[PDB]
Amino acid sequence: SVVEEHGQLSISNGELVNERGEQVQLKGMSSHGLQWYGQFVNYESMKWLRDDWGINVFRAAMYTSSGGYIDDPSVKEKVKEAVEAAIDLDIYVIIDWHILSDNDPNIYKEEAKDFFDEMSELYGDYPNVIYEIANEPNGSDVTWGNQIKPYAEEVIPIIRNNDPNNIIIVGTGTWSQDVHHAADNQLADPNVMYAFHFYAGTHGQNLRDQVDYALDQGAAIFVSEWGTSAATGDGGVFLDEAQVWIDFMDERNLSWANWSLTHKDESSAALMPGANPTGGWTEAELSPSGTFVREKIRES
Numbered sequence: 001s002v003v004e005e006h007g008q009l010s011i012s013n014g015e016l017v018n019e020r021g022e023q024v025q026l027k028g029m030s031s032h033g034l035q036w037y038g039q040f041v042n043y044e045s046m047k048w049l050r051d052d053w054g055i056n057v058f059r060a061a062m063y064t065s066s067g068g069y070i071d072d073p074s075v076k077e078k079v080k081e082a083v084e085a086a087i088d089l090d091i092y093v094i095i096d097w098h099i100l101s102d103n104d105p106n107i108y109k110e111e112a113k114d115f116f117d118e119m120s121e122l123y124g125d126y127p128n129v130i131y132e133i134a135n136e137p138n139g140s141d142v143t144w145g146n147q148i149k150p151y152a153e154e155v156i157p158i159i160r161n162n163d164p165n166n167i168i169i170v171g172t173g174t175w176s177q178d179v180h181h182a183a184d185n186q187l188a189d190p191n192v193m194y195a196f197h198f199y200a201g202t203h204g205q206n207l208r209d210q211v212d213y214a215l216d217q218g219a220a221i222f223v224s225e226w227g228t229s230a231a232t233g234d235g236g237v238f239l240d241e242a243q244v245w246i247d248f249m250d251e252r253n254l255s256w257a258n259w260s261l262t263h264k265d266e267s268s269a270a271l272m273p274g275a276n277p278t279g280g281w282t283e284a285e286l287s288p289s290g291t292f293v294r295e296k297i298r299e300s
């Protein structure tokens with residue numbers, strides 16, 4: 001139903017819109033790293049998230065380092081499983097080249113180009129696909145102008161040769177927080193968005209103002225990762241500040257994916273230990289974070 005109705009997504013005047021020009025907001029879940037918790041990524045769990053939580057997008061977090069794709073490329077087939085499930089379920093899907101410790105996206109740029117060529121060749125005639133080319137650039141030596149923008153100006157043409165206009169999300173500096181610099185020096189492709197990530201454990205007032213600054217320059221923003229915990233993924237759940245951010249995103253038409261769908265014993269995890277990897281969870285099988293996120297998406 002979702003993808004049949006909204007179909008081809010595009011950016012118009014800095015906003016995500018559907019094929020009839022109407023604003024659309026995606027809300028869903030990110031996997032944790034596919035190398036650690038891939039059992040939670042399957043048609044049945046995604047169907048349960050679609051039907052019971054109301055998700056309309058699923059993000060497949062394919063770490064590059066930390067035992068991910070560069071070390072063992074088999075995780076790309078789990079991305080394909082997720083994409084095909086999203087097509088069968090009629091929801092959107094984010095293919096996330098999940099850099100982190102490999103803090104400059106240029107480190108594995110050759111591999112990224114090949115990976116995105118493959119995925120855009122396979123899936124580029126489906127409207128479901130959203131490409132996320134560099135999760136979280138980070139470090140004071142990784143800047144928008146010098147590192148990230150040129151990286152994107154190499155990867156985007158590869159995708160565009162196969163898929164002229166599905167959405168591409170591009171990470172920003174300082175762990176996808178520095179939308180100010182990106183918005184002052186935007187990419188040329190008209191169907192690009194810039195990533196912005198937040199954690200409710202951080203006091204967020206200035207970060208909201210910076211997202212507004214970016215939006216005021218005509219830049220489109222996708223909140224492709226956020227958590228209810230601290231920046232580490234652990235250390236408490238901060239539902240007051242999470243709700244502030246939820247409301248802000250609704251006011252600004254910002255799409256989002258929550259981190260993350262796993263039973264790991266960390267506060268940002270959505271599931272408890274014993275949660276079935278194929279869905280069907282009871283209340284007791286959702287963590288404090290997962291219960292909150294499910295509520296947000298069902299409310300929407």
Ligand SMILES: *[C@H]1O[C@H](CO)[C@@H](O[C@@H]2O[C@H](CO)[C@@H](O[C@@H]3O[C@H](CO)[C@@H](O)[C@H](O)[C@H]3O)[C@H](O)[C@H]2O)[C@H](O)[C@H]1F
Pocket residue numbers: 036066100135136197199225227230231232233234259264266268
């Ligand atoms: C965006 O931020 C989230 C945190 O809010 C990041 O997710 C965290 O990434 C950590 C680093 O990969 C991860 O910890 C690792 O978990 C592995 C599997 O259990 C361990 O083997 C490893 O020792 C540990 O460092 C957190 O569990 C996770 O929440 C996300 O990557 C960022 F994009």
